[PDB]
Symmetry: D3
Amino acid sequence: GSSRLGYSASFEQFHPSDLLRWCQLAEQEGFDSVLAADHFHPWTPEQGQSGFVWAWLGALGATTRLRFGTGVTPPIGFRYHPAIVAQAAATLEAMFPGRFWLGIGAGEALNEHIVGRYWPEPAERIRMLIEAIEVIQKLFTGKVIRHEGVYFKVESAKLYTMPDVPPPIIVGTAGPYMAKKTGQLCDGLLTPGANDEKLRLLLSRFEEGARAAGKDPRRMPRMIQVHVSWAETDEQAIENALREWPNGGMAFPKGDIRNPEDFQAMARLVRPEHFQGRVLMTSDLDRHGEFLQHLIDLGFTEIYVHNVGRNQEEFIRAYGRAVIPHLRWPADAPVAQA
Amino acid sequence: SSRLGYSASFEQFHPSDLLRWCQLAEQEGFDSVLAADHFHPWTPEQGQSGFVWAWLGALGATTRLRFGTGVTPPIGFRYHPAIVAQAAATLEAMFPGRFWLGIGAGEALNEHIVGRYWPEPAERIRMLIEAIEVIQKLFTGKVIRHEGVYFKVESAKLYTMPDVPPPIIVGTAGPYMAKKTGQLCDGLLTPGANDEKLRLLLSRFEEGARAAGKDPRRMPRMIQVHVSWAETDEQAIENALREWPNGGMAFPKGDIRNPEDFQAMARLVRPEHFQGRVLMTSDLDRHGEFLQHLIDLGFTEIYVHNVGRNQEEFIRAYGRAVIPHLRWPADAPVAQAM
Amino acid sequence: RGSSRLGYSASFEQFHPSDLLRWCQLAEQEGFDSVLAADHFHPWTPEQGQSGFVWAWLGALGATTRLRFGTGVTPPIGFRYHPAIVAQAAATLEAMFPGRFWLGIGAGEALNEHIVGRYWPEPAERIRMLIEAIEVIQKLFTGKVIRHEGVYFKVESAKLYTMPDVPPPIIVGTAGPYMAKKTGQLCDGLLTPGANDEKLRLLLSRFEEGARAAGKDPRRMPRMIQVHVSWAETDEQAIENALREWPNGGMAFPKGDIRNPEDFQAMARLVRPEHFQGRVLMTSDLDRHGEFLQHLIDLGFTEIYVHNVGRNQEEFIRAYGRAVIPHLRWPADAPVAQA
Amino acid sequence: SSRLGYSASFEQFHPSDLLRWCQLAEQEGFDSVLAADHFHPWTPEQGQSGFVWAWLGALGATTRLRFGTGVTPPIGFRYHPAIVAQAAATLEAMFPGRFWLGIGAGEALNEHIVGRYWPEPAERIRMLIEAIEVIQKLFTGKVIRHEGVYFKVESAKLYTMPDVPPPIIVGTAGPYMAKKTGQLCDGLLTPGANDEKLRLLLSRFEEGARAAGKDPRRMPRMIQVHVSWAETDEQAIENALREWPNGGMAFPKGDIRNPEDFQAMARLVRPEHFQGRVLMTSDLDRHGEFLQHLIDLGFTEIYVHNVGRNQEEFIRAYGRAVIPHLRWPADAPVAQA
Amino acid sequence: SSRLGYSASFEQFHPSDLLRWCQLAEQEGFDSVLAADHFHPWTPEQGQSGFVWAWLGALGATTRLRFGTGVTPPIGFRYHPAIVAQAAATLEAMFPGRFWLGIGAGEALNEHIVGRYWPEPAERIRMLIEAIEVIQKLFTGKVIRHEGVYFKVESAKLYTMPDVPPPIIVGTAGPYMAKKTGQLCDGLLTPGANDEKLRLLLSRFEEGARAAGKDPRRMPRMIQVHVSWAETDEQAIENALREWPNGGMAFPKGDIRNPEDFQAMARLVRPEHFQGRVLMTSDLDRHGEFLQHLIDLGFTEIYVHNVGRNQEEFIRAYGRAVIPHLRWPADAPVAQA
Amino acid sequence: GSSRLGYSASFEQFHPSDLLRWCQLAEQEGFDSVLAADHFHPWTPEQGQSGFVWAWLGALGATTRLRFGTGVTPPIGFRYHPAIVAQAAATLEAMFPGRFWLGIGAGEALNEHIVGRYWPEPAERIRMLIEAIEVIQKLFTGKVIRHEGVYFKVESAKLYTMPDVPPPIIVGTAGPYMAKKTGQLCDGLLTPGANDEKLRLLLSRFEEGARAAGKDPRRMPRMIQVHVSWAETDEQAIENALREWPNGGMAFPKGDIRNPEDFQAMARLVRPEHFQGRVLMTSDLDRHGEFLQHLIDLGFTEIYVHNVGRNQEEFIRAYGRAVIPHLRWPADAPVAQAM
Ligand SMILES: [Cl-]
Ligand SMILES: [Cl-]
Ligand SMILES: [Cl-]
Ligand SMILES: [Cl-]
């Protein structure tokens, strides 16, 4: 029924004060939710930012009525111990009930390498993520808990500041295996843009995981984050993607690359063709609308849109005028909340 | 000219209540907030522990108060020093001139949850000094590396960095660390104590600053005090016993792990034990004289924690009868980017 | 029906080892038959002011008396002491003084263990360490070459060549219901501190249930209690002695994480006479000491070790020898901690 | 004037027997005891290894002999240095003027049981030097802390502390450590060896002491020797072969882990291998001359280990025919506070 | 004095084929071989990675070529530095005057298999410098010990040791390590790069050597280049794209773990990306001029890797049309004892 | 069967260039296979060598048609990570198909101590060896594999240079337990010379292990390495053994001894009698022949002979003339080679 769409707040690119103002505008223009990445570093120096997301989310919560979530935090003990992520999530939900969702994932070296520890392969980090989920869920019971596993140790700990109902745990992944585990263990899925076949596989795996654990997946959020480039001309939209988001044209695993300067050098190889299916680059707002509608039709219940250009205000107003009012959402779609 | 600091007790109060009370404190003439960084309360009866970093974002966005952590331990248990640096930089970037980073050696109550060796105080001081080195490197806004006894930092840069870093304030009651604070940091925060102990800490801080070529007359010297105001003396005493028995524990508390431990120790505490540690009276003239004495010793800021649950009434009482009558030196330095 | 006897607690926290040796010799003359010695590195407070190395002192006690004796208790969990070393020490004492030694063990306190600067686990984890240590000690007590690899301890090929025919019993010192049950299941007997009747009955009950579920007969297993008392010429002196000398006795809260004597010293300033209720009997009335001890026998304790908290050790020993010990009635076939 | 040290062999003898024999040794004119700190014997045929610290309490309480460990390794395998310090302080507090703390770099035979990396000798020397630092800090009787390469000590104090600490004696056969012993400690203990090696060790010890401003003429220089006395030469030889084949193993033994290893190596040992390492004879005049020669080299105390099981007969024989005829310098320093 | 080096690409070719081709290269006028020490190829399409140390034994025994590792990482992931030292000493002992030990800071592609913390480049340089210290100690042919930040060596000696050690050559493209190479080692190996970068590396190497009292004019300065020769320009370009896309990746590659990662990154590479990194042409005169230019810059040896699978045809073409026309300075130092 | 015998190339004693020339001669004289030890140090300075075996094997492979193997390599992560041993083995077999066998064992401190790590007891090193076998076998599948166990971690790894059929894994052991495990997990057994009873037990255990895992032990190699001393006179043969191989007369475990200088000092105790049953010392080549034939008759399918004297050329020619032609091998006896 009612108008809605998610806005991606790009901490890699934009000063937190600007993001705050733009989220306030996005709310006025019909966006209903915000996705905020948890980075320490940008992908490139040209992007040039990386605010501490947890502080900013407090400001967002206090000055808007938007829903919001981390997209995503790695609670696997490099930058963040899982107990701290649990406390942070509980505090946000306690302050802003019904508004926060905790998005988590297996992390990238770009952010995690700063603490100077062994960086496991993806499959091992998945195992760490699953153990972290166990820790977070124990703490979310609001009782005194202990934990000893392969990766984490928690001595007697309790979250005294705990909402009546915990925030949902959303896993951000593009892997079939983890998508199934997300359905089994967590409350919802967040995935990046990809071709129809890959998206259907992830949805299917998530649903199968949920059903095998006795859950109803039709009531569970299935969310997607997409990257677009809107501008006044097609040429400007293409140029914006090349300059601002060359990582979008890197169709290869990026989780081991440590430095912004590394991505910067790799970016010199990226060309417009490499953004096919990964960043929609056009001035034609009808085409933005059709792209988003197609994702709803596949079964996504929320979409978070990252415009890669620095023209955030103009993008927000353009989407508010020409895109968001024409999107048709199922009336009973679940959203990430409560 | 009129001013005073308010201590926001995360151990006792829900973060939503603290936010509303800080907004009221601003209206009533308080100009600054001190917020503890806890994971656990001292006792179950206190019953809270919000994630301070998220809350500070909300405070920043809804008030014009100055504010700081009182204090964070950046020594790699709950928090890696690089993360504290990023968090501090983000708050100061969002709220320029308003944040001060208070740090300290930490307590087992909060740090023990991660299940690691807990060093003696003198060793934790060495960890704190190394953490300061890490934070200060990151505050240059350049790519830095670090390898010391306690911390390792791979190539790291704070891209989201204010023009001028927030001040680093050390919270300590030790003469040695007070001197080091003057030498290495921007200001001192200390608890209430007798005149002789306070003069020693001030003196050590000043000597440390002077020997490093700094002018200590321009550097904040801050004190956090605990009081109990209520409508009667009897209610004020009862409030301290029930809410803050840790205030009557004249012994080192940094090794005690569990709220349940403090709870059992609290059964020994009696009114006499609060002498010189918590002022318990309905007489607001006596509150005024106690605070004025501390100003006269040379403290440039005072943060007052009322231990009772009557926060709103306390704030209004201090706003009416105490804050207007305090006499501060004209050019006294406050904790702010200088 | 059984002969007169009672245990004496030698307080290493308070008294020079030479004084303890002389007083134990006197205690033997006065009718005490057994000694309990704590294994500390530090006293609870500076005012207590001592901490001898118990293992050396026990050799002196063994060679100059016919008293039975035990550690009350040693922590064999790899901070100050690797379990293999405790096993060797125990085996040597029993080999030198057959039928006289019992090995009392426990999960330890930071006060003593923190000196080696290692991670100090929570109580539940230290229980797991204690259980593994028991396994190590029992393997070594077979007198064969053994190896061990567990979560906490590694033992390469090791054998106790100096080994009595029959091992000393392993006694666990605990006040926890769970560990009391495990003691019955895994060990040879129980040592517990003085406490109210309800708590003592619960511990005995748990110990007995643990023993029975493992197919053992708990009636043949020692159930020992260490009590803290204050005797003096007046009630007022007895109370003052407890306050000054043993304020830790009035600390009804977990003490296993507190590292320094100076920490307990500062905490002691909060302790008052009321806090000793059920923990330290404070009276000059020796009939009342006699009734208190007899009651503990009647509850089912088979040995009692008495720690007088005052510095008046000689006078205490003579008073108990004259007025208390001859009137105690022990069951005839009560099991004592011995091979 | 008359005196001599008795070595109590924990590797061979039940602690009760050692106690009785030390009491007899005192009656027969021995004035001091050296007791090894082992966990295992060299061979199963030796067959013992009492916990020395407990036994020393019994010795202290039933004799007036001086006594020391010969030696303890305080380098954190079986024993953390803080524990050795406490043990030493307790013995000296109980038996003032009687205990000396002999320490050394240890052997795998005893230390391997805890399942940790066993460093080469030169590295274990560095560990020993750090252990000495820890023990000396604790012997001040104040609250101390320590953090070094090998050891960590949190706030620790020996509350049971004699007025004057026991001397620290290092047992070593290495020139380097002998020099360090003179510099850092109170005296030297070394095994029997040829004249040239002994002179080198004494010289290094003296040079180390002098460079640290100490007077080495007031510092103990002690030697432990192995002998075999019996009624006939043939019995003395047989006793050494059966009881102390390790005495005929002229090779480094500090890495060998098991009694069963030494037992198998023992099958190669023959009488010839004891030349200069174990004196084997019934002739007590020859025992006397051997000991006197060591005094003449400058040793101020000698601890004698008779390798045979005939300890009582050995003690009485030495008491009658050897000890009265030894000539000690009048003011020779002994290991004591 | 016609000569040139052949690069044996273990990433691409079966070791039996490499052996046969090196034998042919010798017949055709190549005088030296460079062999990479990999565990994995850059891509599955390359498809090989023999154990170089075994192969070098075969090369040594069936040719008279000089040869070296280009390069081994002796920094304790795949290889402890003591093992590299022994391997180098054995090859030089078997083939005197023929082996040079090329070492470097390593790549995750090969080292990640052991599952350990992978330090940043600057830290791995520090590890490399310590490894050099270990190798040089072992090359003295005496019993040595070592304890540093990264490596521990207990009493160790190379008993099989040539009279004169093989030279240590460092492979690096970093100015700092180039200077350290001049200071600490015997020569430099660097990849192809623009003139300005090559001059900087040579200059740093020379400055390092001179400050340590060495004469850099007597020290090898070696370069490894990648080329693509084929019958047509089009075939040469296609060969580079298919076989060596890593050659068109102008970005740091030392953290990338899997062949599958490079394979996916390769999809972005185009002919333009090989400019200045892989010379792609059928014109052998142009190959000759490219190599001559590097000699003129001051390189004393060049190792040529042809990226195509047409190795035999490449070797014969270079032997006929390139190698005879190269003009080397008369007394140029080569990597040899 | 056709005439054959194995030659042991003693890296402890001989320069690799000499070993290469002698193996080439051994081939001409009727030896068909070579066993090469993987050492870092010799047992004694008087032996005086230790080439890097992996490089030498490349030279051997390229200049002969002999079979050859390591006797043995320890792939347990001191000198060598198991993944590296796998790669090395795969490369040799790829270059010399049908010719290489990978002999592995639990290793000795003499070689492994140089890296300065904890040296486990034999039983623990067996567990490490079993895990190493798991790693090598995973890599020998020629696919991308991962591994995480108690001792080893392997991230995504693949041997791209891999022969069609892997080289056999041969375990060198004298322990009954490991011999059984070798039959169960590996392709063949290598054992030292020993009395008949011990050899029969090892063969039997190996066979039982193979059969219980569904394998056919009749097709699996059972190999023995023996030490002999041949010379012109018996006296010269004895003198050669004393001077060159005193470790042969050390009937005690040698796996913990770190330094050549240690063995050198221990060697001073060794006498001719100590070589009884361990080194055959005689000029009589008929007696060499009977000794070897007896081992064939026990069921060994290959024998590797180490002559301890420096007279290698003369030994090789003597065996080629007088011993090898007279040995009678079973017709279809399995040899260590890919099958
Ligand atoms: Cl993207
Ligand atoms: Cl307080
Ligand atoms: Cl008590
Ligand atoms: Cl042999």
